[PDB]
Structures are given as structure tokens and as C-alpha cells.
């Protein structure tokens, strides 16, 4: 039903810093979730993010101390600010919304890619 659409990918360099956005194009509860998931070349994808009520966050063990997810509840739109990004960090990332009545239905975006570089 509901689009999700990120925007902000690209390219950026190791230690850099990068901010993801996604927008719904309807009406998102503020106590579902809206969350990042992410999926790197020859791994399976993986949880990143997620809030809900506004400022109730959830990281993976691998970002927590550098990422930091933000959600706009009036806009529908949720944010993934990146900083002290590491080479292990390049995937595409996909915003994801969990909703709360059962927890049994998961909404996808179409993905945006991120690339670290190490090269300087
Ligand atoms: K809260
Ligand atoms: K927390
Ligand atoms: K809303
Ligand atoms: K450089």
C-alpha cells in the first residue's frame, strides 16, 4: 500500500559522513517502527536502526557509537545519520516499517546504495 522511498545515498570516504533519509508517502503510526536494514556484497542483509514514539532507538552492536536514527513523526519520515563511517559500512541500505498491531507485516524501500572508499 504505503511507498517507501529513500534518498541520500552515494559515495563517501572512510572516517566520512553520510545522512540517509526515507519518506512514506502515507500516514505511519507513531508507534510503529521505521527502521534501516542494510545488505553488503556476499553478506545476508542485517538490522542497522530502528525508533519508534518518537525517540526510542534500537542500534546493532556494529553502529551503535557512530550512527544515530532520527524520525520525523508529522512528515512520515525517518533519518540515518552516518559519521565515523568504516569500509565495512558499504551496502545498500533499505528503510523498512514494522507495524504494531500483530508485528507480522514488514513494509520495504526500494534500497539506496552507500559506498566507503578507502582510497584517498
Ligand atoms: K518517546
Ligand atoms: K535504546
Ligand atoms: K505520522
Ligand atoms: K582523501
Given amino acids: 500500500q504505503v511507498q517507501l522511498q529513500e534518498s541520500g545515498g552515494g559515495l563517501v570516504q572512510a572516517g566520512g559522513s553520510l545522512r540517509l533519509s526515507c519518506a512514506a508517502s502515507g500516514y505511519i503510526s ?3 517502527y ?8 556476499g553478506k545476508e542483509r542485517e538490522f542497522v536502526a ?3 514514539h518518537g525517540t526510542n532507538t534500537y542500534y546493532a552492536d556494529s553502529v551503535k557509537g557512530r ?3 532520527s524520525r520525523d513523526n508529522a512528515k512520515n519520515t525517518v533519518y540515518l545519520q552516518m559519521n565515523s ?3 565495512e559500512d558499504t551496502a545498500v541500505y533499505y528503510c523498512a516499517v514494522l507495524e504494531t498491531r500483530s508485528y507480522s507485516f514488514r513494509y520495504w524501500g526500494q534500497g539506496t546504495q552507500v559506498t566507503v572508499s578507502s582510497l584517498e
Fill in 30 to 32: 507513531d508507534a510503529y
Fill in 34 to 41: 521505521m527502521g534501516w536494514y542494510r545488505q553488503a556484497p
Fill in 50 to 52: 530502528t525508533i519508534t
Fill in 67 to 69: 550512527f544515530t536514527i
Fill in 85 to 87: 563511517l568504516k569500509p
